């Protein structure tokens, strides 16, 4: 069986296959997924007036957002369960590849929406100080499209090549520091003039940028964060590459889209919070 | 056959099959359980404007629960009828692993929204007065996320273990005791300061919140509530435990959000139902 | 064969077989029943603001049915289609069990939406007089849900125990009766002391909520108003009981709904005829 | 092949099989016809507001019209894809019955919406002068459903017994002539007592309505209009069926809703072009 | 293996098949393609009053045009995943048939809607001088039509007859050409009299017009941009082709759409960039 340059969860499928455990929760995970995204979809557009007009693009974007990860999630849910079949002999669900193989692959080309637009979001709330906003946004973009065309490429590779695996997780990893840099900067920035219930907000957006972006990464190498023939290259592995992807979507993308309209609440000259 | 961790439906699917009732009933169920809460959804929104804008979160929040569930329930229906398949010979539906076993675990982790939002979202009508929202909310969250965990953990075992799924259950009950002990201060300080109408509403709240709620542990150990090789380890106790979750998504759901709402008119200071 | 309990659309789908003018209408009429339904949900939410704020819970209820509605007969339009396969040999359509067998039941568990917020829908239009409000709401849900609930039952019976169908289908007719009688006395209360328009209204609204009722069940009855081996007990029986249903259906929810509409209009005291 | 009473589609898909260019312009047509249809919602939708309250239900007619045709045409688009499918050997796409034939009968009882409320939408906009407006819907609905009947009888025997599709077809085109009459009447009444540039309009919208209406008989006809074993009887004639019915729909529908939004706006009393 | 007038991505399936890279890129960026699309329909719709009363209908065009692609590139994934499929023992996809040939058409037929709405939009936000409105409308609308229906029969040859390919596609590239000669007229016209922040805008619109809309003639050369049995006459041609496509539908309906909406805020009378 040649499975040529796809994802680990193939070949842990075509071999050992999934326990009811595995797939069920991989299925549920991704479920979960998609109905915040979906849920957080109408959150953004019902709450939309709840803050100043010149905020009410963060909404919106928090909302395009929205969009993109449930369409994504949704379709990736599907790919799993039908990438994926009960064997009766033996009572694990095995790779069928009439469904395809399931690629993460998927994620990585949508987040050319959720990146952008998630990094752009924040400056319509905050007011930078020293730095330039066409400069800002366009470090934003460059540095996110490089960080993830890279790293897409790289996935290609987890188990075909994993020198290639490597390098190219690595010069993305460039890419993701910079856009740490950057975005340290605007949250520095953003915190000048404003109350110290604003400066507490950002204070967490911050702490909440840093840890569920730094997820991703950690989704990408997961199947060899315990070595050769580790606890979780295996079901187990899976499993918990799907989890982390969920909680950094639902981080990355709702919470933080939550942050950011409270903040412009505290900002808005006629709201309280 | 080899069915390992399992939820019961599949074993009773496996061996005896399901009668035309049996089988229709719990599709029929199902999809008025996704049906109620699209309807819900549209009731929600259409709604908003009612009631003070202070209260509005509220039906935001009914709103966010009834796409959850919509999604997750939609999901389950069409899970059911593609996990059983009808035999001509016998004239019964058997398990069909093609369309992979059925799993009541889709609901758990899709509670994950449900629970925290139901919870959160009395905090939007009512006041409190000794305790801390900050705080109230915290526990909700908590115990509600380890409610769930522990729970979906313990209902995998089902079948496959008994002692595992009642532990589960056991520890799961606890946070459970914690988030109704917590829900009757909240209620009670809720009535505090104000009008009689807005505190025999509270007292309905707290009776379905009470019954609605206990109705999922119900339909967690439901197989079992006539003992071994009781009435209910059969077809009947498959429907009866999709007939609980439904009735209990339409109370804890559907009814408590228009019971908050109901509530939200009366505390609206130029509007009357 | 063996079917059971089985409605008769899949004894005659297993015996004769459908032609394709008796296969084909069916999956038109329901096709047409829900395109009805999300056309008249567009055409409620889109009117709400034509009335008084008072009046306009009766839209959004109307919005809500057509919701029930819509999905239901979406997804038993879907459940024709799959659950009878062309024969090329005989070129007729017969029983596909692998699309399970066909049942009415979709639609009567949906009615425990449809007839409660039908029946809830007027009293917020109409003044009582002499009859309270809670009163009238509780006996029309109450026997609402006995109505269909036993009607329900029945119908699993209608090939495989004609006495347990005519006895089922009895008692449910008593609970209608029930119905018909409260839904006279909101009719003529509501007529007094309003408008000779509004007048006229509701007289319409009676005679349709009557004969429109009524049809649900001359549906039940369909394949045995012509007697044993009746030119109804046929492929013409299942054409006449889907389109009873789906001229039911259009009368009892979407036209009911214009009338009130209507009725809202000529009470409202902002708005002209 | 024994294939009754059936469109002839399904005679040609069944001997000669049709080509990659029949195949997929069938399918790109009825596709564009879907598209179209639920860009038009939008677009009806979004205007509302720019036309006076008076004018705003021809708005929301459109809108009703295109949801009955979105949901047409969508599962139409479908139906074809899955009643034919490609033979490797000859490289045709042949009748696969496992699809269900097709059938055109599928518009034809959706147009019992379409057909009513086209005629309905006109007298929202344009005041009539010697004709009653409830006198006019009468003839209209009355008219457009026996047309619609007659013809839907018809089209099952284009085949299968020609005599009876000329019949039925010259019956309802009697109906048609009704109601080509009537609406002259009304657009000469619309005209008297407005501005010329709404007399021009109206002029567009007689020219418009009557080919576009006229091309539906002509799509009954299609197969037959190069006589007996024509150039038309074969998948050329085929494509020019579903062509003509994607010219029509566009035309009837969002064309005809565009030159009434366009007169509703010249009669608009304080908004302008 | 016949495939006849199919376009070119078939033949390399049937013959080759595809690596999991080239499958999966075709899939993933087509997911990313109606992911935009959805996206973008949501960001021009709750932006329209961000802008005044007279800009407003071109975010409504947007989002027409934001439906036919969304809906298009949807259907369109949908078929190419539908189209190939996965062969174990070389572990590559290959032409499926029963799930139909794969044909670009698709596009081209929605183009009916895009192409017409895309040049007429900017006439709501531009005002011309010396041009009439109707009259660069008509030349649009004239030439657009006729370019794609050349295009559309040319691409069905694109394998079968290079000969058809090149002569339609040289034709179509001729009312190409004079679409922008058309639009540079209409360009020139709308900076005059207006501030230079929205000429520069204008500026940008040209470009990315230009740009943009020149890819659509490149992914119809594509396979044959490096000759006979050039590099992209291959699984790379394929992806090229698809990626060229996704680039050219977000640069020319997403992007253009949000330079046109930045236009009409700088335009507006009482907001400002
Ligand atoms: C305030 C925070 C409190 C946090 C609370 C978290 C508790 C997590 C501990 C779980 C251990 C219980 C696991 C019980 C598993 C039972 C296994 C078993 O019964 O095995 C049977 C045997 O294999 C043949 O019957
Ligand atoms: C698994 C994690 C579950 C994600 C939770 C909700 C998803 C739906 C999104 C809705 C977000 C609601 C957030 C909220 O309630 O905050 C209100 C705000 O704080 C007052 O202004
Ligand atoms: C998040 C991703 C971060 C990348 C992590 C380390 C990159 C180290 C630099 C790349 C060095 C290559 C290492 C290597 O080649 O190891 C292959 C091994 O021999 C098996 O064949
Ligand atoms: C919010 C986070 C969600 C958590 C979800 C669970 C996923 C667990 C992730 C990482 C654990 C692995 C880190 C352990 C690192 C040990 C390194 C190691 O053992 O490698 C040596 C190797 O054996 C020599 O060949
Ligand atoms: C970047 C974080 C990487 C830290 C993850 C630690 C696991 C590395 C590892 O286990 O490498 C040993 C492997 O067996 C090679 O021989
Ligand atoms: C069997 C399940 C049946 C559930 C069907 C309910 C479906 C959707 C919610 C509809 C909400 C019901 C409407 C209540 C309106 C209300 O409570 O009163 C209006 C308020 O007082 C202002 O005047
Ligand atoms: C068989 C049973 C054995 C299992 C035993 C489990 C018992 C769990 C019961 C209650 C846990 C309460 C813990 C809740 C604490 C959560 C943290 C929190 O809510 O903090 C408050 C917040 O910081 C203020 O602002
Ligand atoms: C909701 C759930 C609440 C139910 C809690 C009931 C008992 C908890 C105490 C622990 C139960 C441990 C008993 C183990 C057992 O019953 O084992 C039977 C048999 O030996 C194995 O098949
Ligand atoms: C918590 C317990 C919930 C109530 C448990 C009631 C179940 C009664 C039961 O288990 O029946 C005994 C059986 O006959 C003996 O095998
Ligand atoms: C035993 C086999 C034969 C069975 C045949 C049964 C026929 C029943 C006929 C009519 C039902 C009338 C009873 C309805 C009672 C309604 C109860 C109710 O809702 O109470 C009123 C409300 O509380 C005030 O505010
Ligand atoms: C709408 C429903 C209206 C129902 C009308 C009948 C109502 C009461 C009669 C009770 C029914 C008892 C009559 C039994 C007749 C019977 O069973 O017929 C013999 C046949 O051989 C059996 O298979
Ligand atoms: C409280 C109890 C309420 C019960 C109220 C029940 C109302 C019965 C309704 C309709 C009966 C009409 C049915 C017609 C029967 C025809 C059967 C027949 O024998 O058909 C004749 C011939 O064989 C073929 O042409
Ligand atoms: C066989 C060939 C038959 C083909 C004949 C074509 C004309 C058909 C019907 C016209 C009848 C007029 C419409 C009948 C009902 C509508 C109506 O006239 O109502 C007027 C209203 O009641 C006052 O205000
Ligand atoms: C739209 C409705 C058209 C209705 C009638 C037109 C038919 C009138 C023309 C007469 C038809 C008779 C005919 O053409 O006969 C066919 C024969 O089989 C060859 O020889
Ligand atoms: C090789 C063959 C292809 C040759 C390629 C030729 C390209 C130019 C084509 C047509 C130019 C003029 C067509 C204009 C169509 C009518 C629209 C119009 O001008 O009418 C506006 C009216 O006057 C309201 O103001
Ligand atoms: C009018 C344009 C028609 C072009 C047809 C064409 O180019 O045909 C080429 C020929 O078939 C090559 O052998
Ligand atoms: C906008 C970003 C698009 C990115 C997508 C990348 C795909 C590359 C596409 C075209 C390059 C090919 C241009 C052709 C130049 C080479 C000409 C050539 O090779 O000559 C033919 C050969 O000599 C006779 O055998
Ligand atoms: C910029 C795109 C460059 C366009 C390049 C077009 C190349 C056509 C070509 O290379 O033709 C080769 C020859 O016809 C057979 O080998
Ligand atoms: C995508 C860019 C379009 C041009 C494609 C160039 C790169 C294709 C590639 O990665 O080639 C390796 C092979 O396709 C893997 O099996
Ligand atoms: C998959 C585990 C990786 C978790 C990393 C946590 C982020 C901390 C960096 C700040
Ligand atoms: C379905 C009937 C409900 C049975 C009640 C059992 C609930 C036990 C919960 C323990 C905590
Ligand atoms: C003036 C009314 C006539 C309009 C034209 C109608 C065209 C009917 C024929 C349908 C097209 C046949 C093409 C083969
Ligand atoms: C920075 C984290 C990267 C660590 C790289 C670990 C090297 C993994 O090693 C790989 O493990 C696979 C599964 O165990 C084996 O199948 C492969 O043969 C082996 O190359
Ligand atoms: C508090 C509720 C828990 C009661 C525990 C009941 C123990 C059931 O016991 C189980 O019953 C199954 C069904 O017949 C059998 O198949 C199993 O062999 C048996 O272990
Ligand atoms: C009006 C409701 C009461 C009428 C009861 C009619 C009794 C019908 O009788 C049934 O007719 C079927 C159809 O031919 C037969 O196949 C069954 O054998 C027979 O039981
Ligand atoms: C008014 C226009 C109707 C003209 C009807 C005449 C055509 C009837 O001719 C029919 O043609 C079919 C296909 O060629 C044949 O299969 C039939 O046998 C033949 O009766
Ligand atoms: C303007 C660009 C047009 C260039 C036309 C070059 C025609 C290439 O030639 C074609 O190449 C195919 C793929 O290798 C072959 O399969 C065909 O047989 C051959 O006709
Ligand atoms: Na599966
Ligand atoms: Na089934
Ligand atoms: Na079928
Ligand atoms: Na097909
Ligand atoms: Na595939």
Redesign the interface.
């Known amino acids: ?6 994802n680990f969860e193939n070949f842990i499928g075509a071999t050992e296959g999934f ?3 595995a ?3 991989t ?3 991704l ?2 997924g ?3 995204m ?2 957080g979809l ?2 953004f ?4 007036k709840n803050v100043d007009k010149k905020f009410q ?1 963060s909404n ?1 974007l928090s ?3 929205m ?2 990860a449930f ?2 999630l949704y ?1 990736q849910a599907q790919n799993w ?1 039908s990438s994926f ?2 064997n ?6 095995f790779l069928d ?2 469904g ?2 399931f ?1 993460n ?2 994620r ?3 987040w ?2 959720d990146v952008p637009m998630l990094l752009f979001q924040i400056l319509f709330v905050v007011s930078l100080t020293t730095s330039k906003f066409s400069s800002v946004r366009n470090q934003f973009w460059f540095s996110g499209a490089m960080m993830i065309i890279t790293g897409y490429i790289g996935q ?1 590779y987890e188990v075909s090549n994993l020198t290639a695996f490597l390098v190219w997780g690595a010069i993305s990893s460039a890419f993701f520091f910079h856009i740490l840099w950057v975005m340290k900067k605007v949250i520095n920035e953003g915190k000048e003039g404003i109350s110290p219930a604003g400066q507490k907000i950002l204070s967490n957006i911050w702490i909440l940028f840093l840890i569920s972006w730094t997820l991703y990464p950690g989704a990408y190498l997961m199947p060899y964060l315990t070595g050769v023939d580790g606890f979780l290259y295996s079901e187990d592995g899976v499993m918990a590459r799907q989890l982390v992807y969920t909680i950094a979507d639902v981080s990355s993308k709702v919470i933080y889209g939550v942050l950011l309209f409270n903040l412009a609440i505290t900002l808005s000259k006629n709201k309280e919070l």
Chains 1, 2, 3, 4, 5 share one sequence.
């Open positions: 069986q040649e499975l040529g340059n796809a326990s009811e455990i797939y069920q929760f299925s549920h995970i479920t979960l998609y109905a915040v979906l849920a109408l959150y557009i019902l709450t939309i693009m919106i909302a395009v957002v969009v993109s369409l994504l379709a369960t079949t009960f009766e002999e033996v009572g694990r669900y590849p009439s395809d193989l690629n692959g998927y990585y080309l949508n050319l929406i290609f």
